[PDB]
């Protein structure tokens with residue numbers, strides 16, 4: 001009886017195995033755009049993905065992860081609210097059963113169709129497993145998806161998903177360029193938070209871009225054909241794999257822009 005996104009094991013249950021679910025810096029949150037304060041001291045984000053080395057795509061039963069070689073400084077996030085250098089390890093998405101829901105963060109209570117998470121770890125902690133034990137261990141770049149025009153740089157991901165339909169399946173996924181998933185503007189909001197899945201560790205500097213990317217209805221429909229189940233198990237579509245907004249508590253969301 002493992003955690004997931006169903007009636008019996010969804011987000012309102014997670015606190016029983018992971019009491020930090022009711023903690024002081026949980027994610028995601030609603031971004032109230034009028035309450036966020038412009039912080040003129042925040043730096044432009046530096047996203048250096050030219051040498052990114054993708055390896056593999058995995059259906060882990062909760063989402064799919066596009067994994068990167070993080071054994072060298074090859075794809076890094078720096079600047080913005082961050083001290084030091086954070087290395088890209090993986091990206092994944094959260095999405096809905098309907099275009100009206102799917103994102104984890106909300107903007108003035110608006111839900112997007114999906115949300116991309118580019119996960120990075122602080123190189124001063126040596127590896128990802130040590131970094132998630134630290135309050136500044138991770139930096140997650142969050143990008144909203146809206147349904148409209150196709151995102152050409154997403155299509156190589158969409159086309160491999162038939163090969164990883166079910167939990168525990170993986171496929172080689174080399175030479176994928178995550179620069180094709182970024183919007184034009186790097187304007188962002190930032191706050192201290194957590195992983196949005198168990199174990200819900202409070203180790204994340206969240207950086208949420210203001211500008212969504214557009215994907216097509218056909219692209220998101222292909223996400224919704226994935227399965228939470230393993231092969232030879234009853235089919236349960238991988239949809240609504242998002243945690244709802246959590247209380248802000250004693251936190252301030254800062255804006256990089258006016």
Ligand SMILES: CN(CCc1ccccc1)C(=O)Nc1cccc(S(N)(=O)=O)c1
Pocket residue numbers: 117119132140194195196197198199
């Ligand atoms: C649920 N797990 C299992 C992996 C795990 C297990 C033990 C320790 C640490 C990590 C997981 O990988 N979550 C996760 C990881 C990175 C980013 C995000 S998100 N959605 O961007 O906040 C969620």
Ligand code: NA
Pocket residue numbers: 033034
């Ligand atoms: Na305002």
Ligand SMILES: [Zn+2]
Pocket residue numbers: 092093094117196
């Ligand atoms: Zn995520």
